[PDB]
């Protein structure tokens with residue numbers, strides 16, 4: 001467990017957070033497109 | 041090569057290559073003249089040389105990368121750059137030339153690592169390959185005549201040279217057991233000793249290693265026998281062992297003469313050969329002296345010269361034995377450290393002269409004898425620095441009342457003429473000066489040198505090993521030039537000789553491609569993809585905003 | 597804390613071996629050139645070996661032996677006959693004149709003294725130096 005923690009101590013979670021942010025932005029864009037389609 | 045080549049560097053290059061002491065420079069000059077005079081072929085070599093000459097590092101690197109003969113091209117380019125860099129006196133051109141030469145040398149060194157690791161046999165085959173019209177010579181032939189000890193110091197090259205020196209002997213046995221196996225005639229009994237990985241019996245003698253061991257045994261035996269002949273027995277008429285000594289020494293002289301004949305130019309430049317040549321030159325004078333007994337004691341004088349040369353032979357004994365595994369490296373650093381010896385000798389000598397000057401101040405008004413003035417001034421402080429201080433003549437022994445005032449008597453030392461039978465020499469300044477000299481020399485200057493020597497070792501100890509490895513090569517090469525032959529049969533063989541006298545490149549290219557891929561991966565390992573990901577995210581956000589604007593426009 | 601110092605000597609003995617060899621060759625040369633002064637023929641293994649070994653062996657440590665020829669000049673005490681067991685001798689003087697020339701013998705004494713007493717000895721201290729600090733860290737473990 002200690003070895004795994006040392007390996008994980010890289011602290012690169014910002015990349016995953018950015019990926020999640022991009023996914024959320026894509027979801028928002030898809031929701032906007034769906035709203036536009038529903039309006040039309 | 042004529043129009044775009046220009047003349048700024050062409051004139052200097054031609055002038056320097058007219059007499060540059062480099063065969064590669066002569067070949068380059070000939071190629072340049074042919075290109076200008078013209079108005080396998082190896083054209084890409086000429087193109088690469090052109091690229092290198094005007095200090096175009098990126099263009100030269102690309103052209104080299106395109107050329108097939110990457111390793112040899114890089115080696116020779118680095119050699120030529122280092123050779124021609126310093127002819128120009130510019131402080132800017134020299135820096136760029138040195139930087140490019142070092143970059144290319146390290147580039148080739150790092151390239152060869154992957155090739156050696158992937159296939160040792162492929163590397164071994166590649167190194168020994170005559171080039172085509174581009175200064176044809178093997179890899180190590182260029183490397184050794186290029187300095188660049190870093191390339192030859194790499195472990196793979198050292199292992200190759202070790203196996204070459206071993207030759208037809210398989211390295212699977214302890215060194216001591218192999219040494220003992222040299223002395224045993226049959227190899228059948230020594231099953232445990234790894235001779236190989238009567239035919240195989242005769243294969244053993246062909247190893248240069250065994251030849252070198254036999255040579256040192258013979259040389260030490262010769263030294264001992266020659267010393268016995270010189271000192272133990274000497275007569276007006278020479279006798280059997282003396283004649284055999286002449287025979288043996290002429291055998292060695294002939295071997296050295298053959299070595300000189302093989303390489304005349306480097307013989308004079310080489311330092312070690314000079315000492316043995318001088319020793320032989322004095323030895324022939326020794327024979328001349330012993331020829332005719334013109335005077336009753338005229339033979340002892342020549343025996344003196346014989347002995348003086350014997351000293352030089354004793355030194356050559358160490359000279360030849362230089363490289364011996366862990367023993368050899370210690371010898372080299374002494375050559376570099378001799379500067380400290382020189383400086384210490386000078387500094388101590390001046391103090392010696394002053395103390396000798398002040399020793400004679402006690403003595404009589406006028407020595408009037410070069411013999412004793414020189415003898416005393418030199419000899420006395422020379423002991424004091426080592427032991428048994430001489431000032432005991434004046435202080436420790438006070439007055440011994442033994443002086444030969446008359447010049448006829450050859451008696452050491454004297455005392456200044458006593459006044460009214462009273463010893464006039466005053467102690468109150470003479471003895472303190474003795475103490476000052478003792479303190480200055482025995483305990484300060486001596487103990488300085490130890491400290492000095494200290495810094496000389498640790499600072500330069502790391503590099504020393506490399507040099508030793510380099511030196512190792514030379515001996516191998518030498519014993520590779522003479523192959524294997526016993527000394528007495530060696531003389532006869534020399535006389536007889538005097539009477540008589542593709543796929544690897546493709547593999548290297550593939551390895552170079554793999555190495556370039558590795559270099560590209562190392563460059564790309566920066567791991568800066570997050571910037572590109574952020575740029576893509578911004579582009580996606582802009583696209584979403586544009587889509588929203590388009591939807592709004594469609595609604596309106 | 598006493599024990600660790602012993603081990604490093606075993607590793608450092610290589611320096612002792614190398615120094616012994618290098619000093620021995622110089623010793624042999626100087627012993628060769630010491631006997632050049634002496635009579636044409638020693639004809640006695642006993643004294644030739646005794647002198648050649650023993651003399652430079654002191655010179656390297658102390659009380660240089662060349663005082664037989666230079667410092668003491670000629671003592672006029674030689675047993676030319678082999679029967680007499682007397683140390684040392686002088687080359688047969690020509691017309692009662694000591695034939696041994698100083699102008700080369702004494703300089704050689706000085707060269708040997710410089711080579712051995714102050715250079716080869718003071719080398720070993722330096723050498724030993726690097727042997728310690730480089731390997732001192734590991735020694736404790738052993």
Ligand SMILES: [Ca+2]
Nearest residue numbers: 296312313316
């Ligand atoms: Ca030689």
